[PDB]
Design a protein around this ligand. Structure first.
Ligand SMILES: Nc1ncnc2c1ncn2[C@@H]1O[C@H](COP(=O)(O)OP(=O)(O)O)[C@@H](O)[C@H]1O
Ligand SMILES: Nc1ncnc2c1ncn2[C@@H]1O[C@H](COP(=O)(O)OP(=O)(O)O)[C@@H](O)[C@H]1O
Ligand SMILES: Nc1ncnc2c1ncn2[C@@H]1O[C@H](COP(=O)(O)OP(=O)(O)O)[C@@H](O)[C@H]1O
Ligand SMILES: [Mg+2]
Lengths: 373, 701, 146, 373, 373
């Protein structure tokens, strides 16, 4: 009885799912639940009271966009259940009671989150078996490596996990709540300097698209600020969905710099380079050599052009001058975690590490804290 | 003359006795032996035109008890069984390469065609012409044979109301690892060398094929001229048959183009060139890939991006990934293997379509299959061959146990309770789902930072306590598996490079849009006919499962073939070679199935002295079981003696023989002392009883 | 043992013994026999008296005397045991034992006998032309008497 | 049937083995058994749960180093059995049931140690014959001499054995528990004066490497202390495995001086020179002349540059002023004991002094106390 | 000229100072230097750019808390100078040039620390005389004893010092870098299991207050874990400074257990009970009896309710079954070291063991290594 196990990377801002053994996610759509707010006047078109991610993307102008997952933790459980039901039935058209499912999670997430996730996916969808895997180990699986620090930076969380030859160092795991959504909010707040006002949720997503299509990270900040406010070479234009053209100057690269300077939002934490260096310096010396030599990336918010060069420069400035820093920036930073999950779920030696229905029924939901990580 | 057709009736069954019987029958110019359901044939190296059409009427099924054991009896047996049980069946031809399997197939096809008096009128049904062609496509030189079948040839002869219809041919277990890799002192499939030897000039100037001796897919063996018996005349006759099959010159030209493309792809190298953040890959010479593109009707940039970049394509974007050198080599090897497999499938499909018979008709099966292999050093191909032979040996053991059970029931009802131990643990050790060896290998294929040492260590860990597994003592890169034919030691050198048969969808999409029609049609058909996996072992297991399902759809009955000394000596052989071939075939397991089998008249005759049996002409009703108790105090454990006579178990048999020889020794001592007493008593009469009286007369007067 | 004794042959035993073992160490000499037979006197001749004895059995003693008398032949060679031993090599009721059969049985198994012993048997064994020796008459004559 | 007997000098910190008749040990590796301590996250790489000396050297950062032999006595028997099995099979690739084996031992070791060593090497490996020889007599064999006092100072024990023309003086054998491992611990405790902290086992072995590569013994202590704290001429720099440079001053030579001044660790015993002199003065006068004239060295921890000159100066200050002291310092102080064992095991007159399997089976393990020394 | 000498116990997280001869420290305040981080908008209130411990405690929300002393060693010298100047002038209102001062230190601290401490306190404040005393001897002074092992566990270091009748055993001094600050960090990292996020420095100190007010040490760990995850009897509630109520379960006692199980943070060292037992077993037998009988405590981080009972149970399980273990837990574990320093500085026989200004000026700062300990 051959049954491919589903791999459902339900990230913080985008849901990436598919079957195990493929090379790319079958379905990719934002994790948004939309509800209309105005009053319906045409008799008959007042029945669809909830639009899942892509449909709510198509109809931004007459409804409100709410993200069920805020900064990693699942806030609204009913919306997340709706998203899971949609991505199981209306998107893959595969009954979830005949296929095992794999789910991902941030490292330092609360425990009630896992307990409720297991309870929902065992009681509602009646999945035969499920598993919860940290995203960094899946990123390392997908990168085809066994050593190095994973810098997984989605839009809800940014965490480092040092691994050496398969043995994780759980006391060096660092997690930051600064991610892509906060970059989008800073871009919204910094675009007002030129007069463009974005307040609604649809305008917030327009700003998100602007960030994806225009923003980049510079090697040096003072030099690039001088260049921007010394000419018009860095200015680029964007077209809003009503044909209105906007122009962006030094705001192009001052949006993603807050990753290295989180004092712009007012956070007391340090940049991603500093957290990576501190996580290395929480590990053993023999570990430290290979952690220096094998930095790896993942997550969407690390796709800014020029991120690798600057973080290499910063680590080299921080690390001792005699060591070799080599930062891996594969062109699949997006959904590398899903590729790793698909590789992991296709292993025949993984068949014994599921969470069978009998186990959950006999020992209760607490076994998700025992069989994971 | 010396029949001994059924060795079950002898006092005991040993491999030595079986070897002696086969030697005696071979010296009697007898090849086939009728061991109940099973048949055994030996390659004689002797051209025996046994009879002619008369042998069908001479060796039919009406007098199987008196008819000599012959190969052609199964021809009538098949019809007799299908006309009674109303169920078609299958016949397999198994044996090591060079054991006359093709000769046996030709003989059985001739006998089946000659039994209906119609083949003379409908000889145009063009059946066996392509056998040499499938041979050139499916055979290759091995270190022990210059003609070895490396694919599971399957010919299906169709019948409808006694009328012989057309035939359908298929391949099951072709080894795709041979095309790109080959051991020392062996070589690739014969047709590449045949094409390179029989190549006309116009292909030499048009196609760049002047490096016939330096292709990487061919020079790996190190010596390609050992097969010098083959020549361009084989190519000429292959082309003659190829044209006979109704193929136009365009099809042959396209086939040669694909073969030349594969050979050129063999000669492609990569360089560990620097890039943005790593060192990934770079094509050394672009003229070769350009030449490949010219003769394949496909873009060259497509091949560059399909063998250099990895494509991860989702709905909204398509991302190109640089590849490592090993990954590029694996992709190139996968492309070559899939091209060769598609060519073979296309040719088989066309041959079947030319002589396609009616549907929903009766059918008899002929299966040409591998032989058990045990070389000086063993590799992945030998492991797969051994796994397939293990499955077939399991089927053969099931058949033998079924025959034993039906015989036992035919004697008395209550011996169906006798059990039997199969080779299922070996099959589980090889390919059980959770922690099989092939499953571990498949997991190691995709696992990050994997090597041969890690795979060997994991195999050692998961199978330490398995009785069939045997960890080597020294830290050697080997392991030993206990097959039914004995211990086989494999080497884990280069397993990970023999399984990376990963073909991404972009390659198939590129080959669908080719300008030539044949390649596009083949790839479109492959995509249309296509759950699966992406390793050589997984495809081999899937094909083996399909073959097992096809076999279990019908009733299995087959025949084994053995080989004398491989120096092609007619009528001369080594008993050690016979022992090796008997062990490899699997007929030795019949002795293990016997576990007891001894007669009753032996007890009637030569087991009376112990109690000095007073009576004569004992019947079966004589106190027999307790007799032993009154002479050896052994509990009744013989199955049953009675008239149904297969009861005495081996160790008790040897105990009885030892007791018999001891009794004979004591009786001989008694006879010796009795003769000594008689001699001395003669001495006593002599010196007094016939002398003192004479002396009385001498003193007298 | 002497407790059960076949007195028919005890006289034969005592005669043979008193002729072989006398009031001396055990050695048997021409003197004793010659005296007991013709001590009166016979003129010497050499018609057939240049070779008398060549196969002496061995030494004799009174302890060995009694042991051999008790063990060797007193009530031995039972008829049933004779039939059993002779038929152990035979399946026929009549006891046809092929002469060659016994030839290999004696010269091939156990301690080896010589063809001279086989001839000794044949020189007294009644055997049919085909060589199937029988032993019913053998037992009859052996048990009957002299 | 020519069968070379194995010589396995299983010292206190390093295992040096090989065949008899060679001139150098075939295999040299630390006697360490390593076990991982963290949690494995990659499915599949959780099977190798014990790393023998060199493998555990390569992977210090994810496992704990335990020495089975502590101060000469064998503490953990299972770890020592694992080390023996490794050095027989995975290192020499020679079946131990076909070759006799020779083992070394400290002079005043307990008796249960010998009994258990013989029991293990006869029952597990089924060696045809074995022998236990004191290390000092083998050192004298290797030095090509027959008189003099052997100062065998490994990393677990430091003992003197006076021998004159092959007749040992067992009442003059002195043994100290101060050896190289205690020097390494003192170096760890004395490096904290400059701020370098070494606590783990891997850091302890880094300190051991520092000691091997930098430490030396001075002729005079007060003069060299003044020189060190009067300039920077004695300062040398070392590079840790993460490119971090450390500087060492007067700690360079104050680590190996505790051999001559064991009051630094607090021991009440006296220095090696004092123990050698007292061992001489426990011998006869005619013995004393040749013991003075023929001092010899062995063991790893006597390889410090300048040890011979200082101990010569100290013995000359102790011994009467008219006698000639000549200290032999061959350049093979390391594995001189193994060279002596190889010479001893290759003698054809040694064939009758083995411990055959029949002897052990008939008389029990106690014969190791009868046929040794 | 009667002049009381100041006693300034500048610990790792709290400064406890006062005059000699008192019974309690005059001034107690955290050793924190705070600096504002936001931008000032009101003209005039932008001058106070550095807040010393208590003022920085009052204004946590607009500034960053930095501890000058990290794990015993003094990292930032200017901040420590500011703290000393504050505690001399703005807190005691006593000119430091007219009073001798006494300072404490960890046992195995670096030497440059002492040299710079003496240089600063002689050149800046112009103190007539100063002295540096180990904290364990002062703890023994305050306990009114002369034998036993001191377990001084502040928030920067945890060290044992065995003393018998006034004669210290310097080769049995053990020092661990696991202390209260690492317990606070573990509590921060373990509170995320319930969803409470504490990242800033002010939130770190809120977690410190939680640890002080709620944490305890249990006798048995498995039994108490079962009890905690079998009922709600151990759950207690705490009120954050904004009226938000938090609930703590089994995290209440799993924070201070890492003292006995330092593998939770990943350290390879052993618990405090194991280090105490090993320090005893590094001493002489006659010493060992009285060290068993007279265990004593000090330092703040030993004030957890139930620490004495568990460490007594552990020592009794480790020590031989016939000996009597009696652990002294006086109710002044906090600032017992200061009471001992005040007793020591008030002795008239101590007047000759100061470090006079003439001595330092003539012989340089190196005399602090000669007249101390
Ligand atoms: N090409 C890009 N350039 C910059 N930012 C991107 C790009 N693609 C995605 N992102 C950002 O990454 C965030 C989430 O991406 P991803 O990591 O794929 O999903 P998740 O965070 O759910 O794992 C989005 O909020 C988006 O702003
Ligand atoms: N070149 C060297 N200089 C100083 N010390 C050394 C040197 N080589 C080895 N050592 C010390 O010798 C100790 C053990 O060496 P050795 O005597 O060869 O092994 P064993 O003590 O097992 O016989 C090690 O702990 C090491 O510190
Ligand atoms: N009542 C208490 N319960 C638990 N921990 C405490 C208590 N009082 C103080 N601490 C801890 O002790 C640490 C320092 O206290 P203390 O030893 O007095 O200062 P120092 O470590 O500077 O000598 C603080 O970090 C605090 O966490
Ligand atoms: Mg992600």
């Amino acid at each position: 009885d051959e049954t491919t196990a589903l791999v459902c990377d339900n990230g913080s801002g985008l849901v990436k799912a598919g079957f195990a053994g493929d090379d790319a996610p079958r379905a990719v759509f934002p994790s948004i639940v939309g509800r209309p707010r105005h009053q319906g006047v045409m008799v008959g078109m007042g029945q669809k009271d909830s639009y899942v991610g892509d449909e709510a993307q198509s109809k931004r102008g007459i409804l409100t966009l709410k993200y069920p997952i805020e900064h990693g933790i699942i806030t609204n459980w009913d919306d997340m259940e709706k998203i899971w039901h949609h991505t199981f039935y209306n998107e893959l058209r595969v009954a979830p009671e005949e296929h095992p499912t794999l789910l991902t999670e941030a490292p330092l997430n609360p425990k009630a989150n896992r307990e409720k996730m297991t309870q929902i996916m065992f009681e509602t969808f009646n999945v035969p078996a499920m598993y919860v895997a940290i995203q960094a180990v899946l990123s390392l699986y997908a990168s085809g490596r066994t050593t190095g620090i994973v810098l997984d930076s989605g839009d809800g969380v940014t965490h480092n996990v040092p691994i050496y030859e398969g043995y994780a160092l759980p006391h060096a795991i660092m997690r930051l709540d600064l991610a892509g959504r906060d970059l989008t909010d800073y871009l919204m707040k910094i675009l007002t300097e030129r007069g463009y006002s974005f307040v609604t949720t649809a305008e917030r997503e327009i700003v998100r698209d602007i960030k994806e299509k225009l923003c980049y990270v510079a090697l040096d900040f003072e030099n690039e600020m001088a260049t921007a406010a010394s000419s018009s070479s860095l200015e680029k234009s964007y077209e809003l969905p009503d044909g209105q053209v906007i122009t962006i100057g030094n705001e192009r690269f001052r949006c993603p710099e807050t990753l290295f300077q989180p004092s712009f939002i007012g956070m007391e934490s340090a940049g991603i380079h500093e957290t990576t260096y501190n996580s290395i310096m929480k590990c053993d010396i023999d570990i430290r050599k290979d952690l220096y030599a094998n930095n790896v990336m993942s997550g969407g918010t690390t796709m800014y052009p020029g991120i690798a060069d600057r973080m290499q420069k910063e680590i080299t400035a921080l690390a001792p001058s005699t060591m070799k820093i080599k930062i891996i920036a594969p062109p699949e930073r997006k959904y590398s975690v899903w590729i790793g999950g698909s590789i992991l779920a296709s292993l025949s030696t993984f068949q014994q590490m599921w969470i069978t229905k009998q186990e959950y029924d006999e020992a209760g939901p607490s076994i998700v804290h025992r069989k994971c990580f | 003359e010396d029949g001994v057709e059924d060795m079950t009736q002898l006092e005991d069954l040993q491999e030595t006795t079986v070897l002696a019987n086969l030697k005696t029958r071979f010296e009697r110019n007898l090849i086939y032996t009728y061991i109940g359901s099973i048949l055994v044939s030996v390659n004689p190296y002797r051209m025996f035109a046994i009879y002619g059409p008369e042998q069908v009427q001479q060796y039919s099924g009406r007098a199987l008890g008196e008819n000599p054991p012959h190969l052609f009896a199964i021809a009538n047996l098949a019809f007799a069984k299908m006309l009674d049980a109303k169920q078609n069946q299958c016949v397999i031809i198994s044996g090591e390469s060079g054991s006359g399997k093709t000769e046996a197939t030709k003989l059985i096809l001739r006998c089946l065609a000659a039994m209906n008096q119609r083949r003379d009128v409908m000889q145009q049904i063009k059946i066996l012409e392509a056998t040499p062609l499938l041979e050139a496509f499916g055979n290759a030189k091995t270190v022990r044979n210059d003609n070895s079948s490396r694919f599971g040839k399957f010919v299906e002869i169709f019948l409808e109301g006694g009328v012989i219809c057309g035939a359908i041919t298929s391949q099951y277990l072709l080894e795709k690892s041979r095309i790109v890799f080959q051991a020392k002192n062996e070589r690739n499939y014969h047709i590449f060398y045949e094409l390179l030897a029989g190549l006309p000039a116009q292909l030499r100037q048009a196609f760049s094929l002047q490096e016939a001796e330096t292709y990487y897919y061919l020079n790996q063996g190190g010596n390609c001229e050992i097969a010098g018996k083959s020549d361009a005349d084989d190519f000429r006759r292959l082309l003659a048959a190829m044209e006979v099959l109704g193929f136009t010159s365009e099809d042959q030209d396209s086939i040669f183009r694909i073969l030349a493309s594969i050979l050129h792809l063999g000669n492609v190298y990569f360089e560990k060139h620097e890039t943005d953040a790593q060192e990934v890959a770079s094509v050394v010479s672009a003229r070769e890939i350009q030449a490949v593109a010219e003769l394949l009707q496909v873009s060259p940039e497509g091949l560059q991006k399909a063998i250099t970049f990895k494509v991860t394509e989702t709905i909204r974007e398509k991302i190109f990934t640089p590849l490592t050198v090993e990954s590029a080599v694996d992709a190139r090897d996968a492309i070559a293997k899939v091209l060769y497999a598609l060519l073979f499938g296309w040719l088989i499909t066309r041959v079947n379509a030319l002589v396609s018979p009616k549907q929903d008709t009766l059918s008899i099966a002929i299966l040409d299959i591998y032989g058990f292999e045990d070389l000086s050093f063993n590799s992945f191909e030998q492991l797969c061959i051994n796994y397939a032979n293990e499955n077939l040996q399991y089927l053969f053991n099931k058949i033998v146990f079924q025959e034993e059970q039906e015989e036992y029931i035919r004697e008395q009802m209550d011996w169906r309770e006798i059990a039997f131990a199969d080779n299922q643990p070996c099959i589980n050790l090889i390919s059980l789902k959770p922690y099989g060896i092939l499953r571990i290998l498949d997991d190691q294929c995709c696992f990050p930072q994997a090597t041969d040492h890690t795979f060997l260590q994991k195999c050692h860990y998961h199978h330490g306590a398995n009785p069939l597994y045997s960890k080597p003592k020294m830290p050697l890169p080997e392991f030993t598996i206990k097959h039914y034919a004995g211990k086989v030691t494999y080497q884990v050198h280069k397993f990970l490079d023999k399984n990376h048969d990963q073909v991404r969808q972009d390659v198939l999409d590129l080959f669908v849009h080719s300008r030539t029609r044949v390649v596009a049609h083949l790839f479109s058909s492959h995509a249309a006919q296509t759950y699966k996996a992406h390793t050589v072992a997984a495809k081999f297991q899937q094909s083996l499962l399909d073959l097992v399902e096809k076999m279990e759809r019908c009733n299995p009955l087959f025949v084994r073939c053995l080989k004398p000394n491989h120096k092609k000596e007619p009528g001369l052989f080594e008993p050690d070679v016979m022992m090796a071939q008997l062990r490899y075939s699997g007929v030795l397991e019949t002795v293990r199935i016997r576990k007891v089998r001894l007669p009753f008249q032996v007890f009637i005759d030569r087991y009376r002295c112990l109690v000095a049996l007073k009576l004569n002409v004992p019947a079966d009703g004589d106190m027999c079981v307790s007799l032993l108790s009154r002479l050896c105090t052994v509990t009744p454990d013989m199955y049953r003696v009675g008239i149904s006579k297969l009861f005495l178990k081996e160790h008790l048999h040897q105990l009885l023989e030892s007791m018999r020889e001891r009794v004979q020794n004591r009786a001989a001592l008694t006879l010796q002392r009795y003769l000594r007493g008689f001699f001395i008593q003669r001495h006593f009469r002599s010196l007094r009883r016939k002398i003192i009286l004479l002396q009385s007369r001498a003193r007298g007067f | 043992v002497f407790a059960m004794f076949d007195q028919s042959q005890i006289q034969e035993f005592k005669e043979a013994f008193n002729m072989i073992d006398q009031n001396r160490d055990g050695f048997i000499d021409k003197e004793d026999l010659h005296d007991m037979l013709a001590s009166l006197g016979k003129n010497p001749t050499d018609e057939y008296l240049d070779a008398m004895m060549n196969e002496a059995p061995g030494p004799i003693n009174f302890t060995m005397f009694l042991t051999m008398f008790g063990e060797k032949l007193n009530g031995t060679d039972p008829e049933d045991v004779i039939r059993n031993a002779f038929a152990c090599f035979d399946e026929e009721a009549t006891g046809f034992i092929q002469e060659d059969y016994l030839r290999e049985l004696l010269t091939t198994m156990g301690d080896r006998f010589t063809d001279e012993e086989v001839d000794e048997l044949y020189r007294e064994a009644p055997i049919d032309k085909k060589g199937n020796f029988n032993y019913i008459e053998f037992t009859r004559i052996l048990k009957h008497g002299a």
